[PDB]
Enzyme design. Structure first.
Site, PDB file in Angstrom:
ATOM      1  N   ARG A 108       0.835  -1.192   0.000  1.00 40.31           N
ATOM      2  CA  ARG A 108       0.000   0.000   0.000  1.00 40.31           C
ATOM      3  C   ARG A 108       0.879   1.254   0.000  1.00 40.31           C
ATOM      4  O   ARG A 108       0.437   2.281  -0.469  1.00 40.31           O
ATOM      5  CB  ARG A 108      -0.991  -0.019   1.172  1.00 40.31           C
ATOM      6  CG  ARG A 108      -0.349   0.235   2.529  1.00 40.31           C
ATOM      7  CD  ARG A 108      -1.300   0.229   3.711  1.00 40.31           C
ATOM      8  NE  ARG A 108      -0.570  -0.052   4.951  1.00 40.31           N
ATOM      9  CZ  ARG A 108      -0.377  -1.268   5.502  1.00 40.31           C
ATOM     10  NH1 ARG A 108      -0.868  -2.363   4.932  1.00 40.31           N
ATOM     11  NH2 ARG A 108       0.300  -1.388   6.635  1.00 40.31           N
ATOM     12  N   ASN A 109       2.126   1.132   0.487  1.00 39.08           N
ATOM     13  CA  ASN A 109       3.020   2.256   0.699  1.00 39.08           C
ATOM     14  C   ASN A 109       4.188   2.168  -0.271  1.00 39.08           C
ATOM     15  O   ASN A 109       5.210   2.822  -0.066  1.00 39.08           O
ATOM     16  CB  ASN A 109       3.464   2.398   2.157  1.00 39.08           C
ATOM     17  CG  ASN A 109       2.327   2.843   3.050  1.00 39.08           C
ATOM     18  OD1 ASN A 109       1.300   3.279   2.542  1.00 39.08           O
ATOM     19  ND2 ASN A 109       2.469   2.692   4.363  1.00 39.08           N
ATOM     20  N   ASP A 156       5.120   7.137   2.587  1.00 32.39           N
ATOM     21  CA  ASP A 156       4.466   7.161   3.890  1.00 32.39           C
ATOM     22  C   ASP A 156       5.485   7.024   5.017  1.00 32.39           C
ATOM     23  O   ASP A 156       5.714   5.933   5.567  1.00 32.39           O
ATOM     24  CB  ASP A 156       3.227   6.257   4.001  1.00 32.39           C
ATOM     25  CG  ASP A 156       2.551   6.344   5.365  1.00 32.39           C
ATOM     26  OD1 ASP A 156       2.906   7.264   6.144  1.00 32.39           O
ATOM     27  OD2 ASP A 156       1.693   5.483   5.666  1.00 32.39           O
TER      28      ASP A 156
END
Ligand SMILES: *CCC(=O)Nc1cc(Nc2ncc(C(=O)OC(C)C)c(-c3cn(C)c4ccccc34)n2)c(OC)cc1N(C)CCN(C)C
Ligand SMILES: *CCC(=O)Nc1cc(Nc2ncc(C(=O)OC(C)C)c(-c3cn(C)c4ccccc34)n2)c(OC)cc1N(C)CCN(C)C
Lengths: 279, 278
Positions: free
Chosen positions: A136-137, A150
């Site tokens: 996701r990052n 992030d």
């Protein structure tokens, strides 16, 4: 030295929201730097000192930087401090693999694995512990070029520190090293653990690790010696690296530097290490 | 609370296919315990989803609502089958196509009341349907319609207000903007879908945003374009739908307000719907 460029609120505009939570809101925006005549696509985060911590950490590792780490472009001082960052226009890799699952060649998958390692190796060179590595990052500038993102939880280690002792919650567990889960210890080696889960996510085209298993049972399940299953496309050599990243002994886990080398070998001959239908 | 009835597979047989696709296959069937017309879903991840659908249907079965298709039970066999009541007249999407020319406004507005009554029950039960649409509303009698197809439905925890999707596949043209952009889902996102559904009933079954690809809808909506007023709708009716399609979720009508409004209109059908032949 960490040097934050201050941007005026008339320099940039929020076009549209990309994502929101209780982590704050992230917009796509455009930024015209003062004394330039061009528009720069940028990402903007706003909600408090947590955001300043984030900015500091990003700026600490800005020089000389790495192509596989998201750069801070500057900060703005409104009611709420805002983070202005580079924009990765293709979104996070999590969502990219799920959406394009059926078009992703083995070359791309191992290529991403190398870049992520390259990025994390730089971070470690700069004494940064990320603490939230996940698919996701990892964000996609172009299909051929990805970047770690992030820095909300990221920490810098002092000259004679080897670890960071954390205080409190707000940490995602299914990505955490066992010693992080049980002792709130984080190190370069704990980020390696996370890197393993991340490669896992990529290799399963975005399956949710430890699916259905509650977060309360993970330290139990990990202590008992359960780990994430071998992904279908993965030869045993690939799944071995992952398994190394989840060793109980932190120093037994691979070093990002080795990971670069290993995945570079595999990426140099991808169909030999991943078996994807359609290559 | 939630109870799951398991039924003897040998008590019934699939009589014919009612429809199918990638969601699986629904049949007409006949349940002979020791004759009850029934409808039967099975498929070909997918196996877990059909148990989720059963759980969700069972979770809202007590006391249930007349405008919500009840799960009768599951059958085991090779794969889990869902046994539901059978609606003998089919989905509303078809019914208003095949009877365009013989539907009293009283009926049309009645159906809008019943749909809202069913959705409001779901909302009390903390269930977000996620797939409200004319196709998903079936007719048992002319006077009795029911919400159906819990394939995507989700329950909320006691202190959850929204459901965050994993993307996947979803019907974009029935979705609230916050669902297309941020894949958030709430009771108020269902209210959007209700708006579109009423739209499809008023237009005797027109394809919403007929012609536009699904990739371009969120732009149209962001700009502030909506579906056109249907010919038979007075402005009162169209205003209702348009309120469902408001950017601010918390400014949409609640199903409880839709029950009230459409019941009012139903008490005087010709005043709100102009239909040639009434
Ligand atoms: C996985 C969801 C996602 O990441 N989605 C997404 C992301 C982006 N681009 C983008 N670029 C930079 C940054 C960034 O470094 O932001 C800093 C913190 C200001 C971000 C971003 C960072 N965080 C923590 C986010 C949380 C949520 C959303 C984004 C970020 N994001 C774009 O750029 C167009 C789009 C995008 N999409 C379209 C949403 C879901 N798709 C993947 C389907
Ligand atoms: C518009 C398609 C349609 O709904 N057609 C249709 C439907 C039905 N009756 C019926 N009764 C119950 C259920 C139901 O609750 O199934 C659960 C999931 C087991 C269904 C039904 C549910 N889904 C999701 C369906 C998808 C496709 C088809 C049916 C269902 N359907 C009947 O029974 C008479 C007939 C029927 N006709 C014959 C198809 C087209 N005519 C309406 C023109």
């Amino acid at each position: 030295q960490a040097l934050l460029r201050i941007l005026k609120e008339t320099e940039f505009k929020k076009i549209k929201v990309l994502g929101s939570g209780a982590f704050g809101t992230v917009y796509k925006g455009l930024w015209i730097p003062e004394g330039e005549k061009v528009k720069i696509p940028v990402a903007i985060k706003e909600l408090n000192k947590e955001i300043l911590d984030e900015a500091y950490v990003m700026a600490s590792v800005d020089n000389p930087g790495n192509p596989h780490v998201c750069r801070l472009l500057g900060i703005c001082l409104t009611s709420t401090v805002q983070l202005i960052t580079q924009l990765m226009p293709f979104g996070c890799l999590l969502d990219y693999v799920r959406e394009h699952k059926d078009n992703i060649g083995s070359q791309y998958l191992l290529n991403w694995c190398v870049q992520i390692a390259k990025g994390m190796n730089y971070l470690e060179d700069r004494r940064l512990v990320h603490r939230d590595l996940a698919a996701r990052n990892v964000l996609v500038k172009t299909p051929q070029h990805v970047k770690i993102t992030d820095f909300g939880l990221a920490k810098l280690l002092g000259a004679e520190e080897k670890e960071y002792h954390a205080e409190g919650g707000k940490v995602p567990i299914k990505w955490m090293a066992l010693e992080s889960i049980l002792h709130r210890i984080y190190t370069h080696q704990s980020d390696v653990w996370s890197y393993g889960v991340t490669v896992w996510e990529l290799m399963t085209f975005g399956s949710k690790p430890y699916d259905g298993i509650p977060a309360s049972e993970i330290s139990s399940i990990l202590e008992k010696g359960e780990r994430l299953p071998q992904p279908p496309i993965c030869t045993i050599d690939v799944y071995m690296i992952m398994r190394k990243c989840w060793m109980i002994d932190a120093d037994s886990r691979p070093k990002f530097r080795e990971l670069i080398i290993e995945f570079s070998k595999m990426a140099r001959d991808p169909q030999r290490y991943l078996v994807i239908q359609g290559d």
